């Protein structure tokens, strides 16, 4: 789910970039 906000997907990029983003 994170991927689906642009700083999620950057701050997050272990999670959206291994976790499926979620």
């Given at each position: ?13 272990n ?8």
């Amino acid at each position: 789910g994170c991927c689906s906000n642009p700083v999620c997907h950057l701050e997050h990029s272990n999670l959206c970039g291994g976790a499926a983003g979620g």
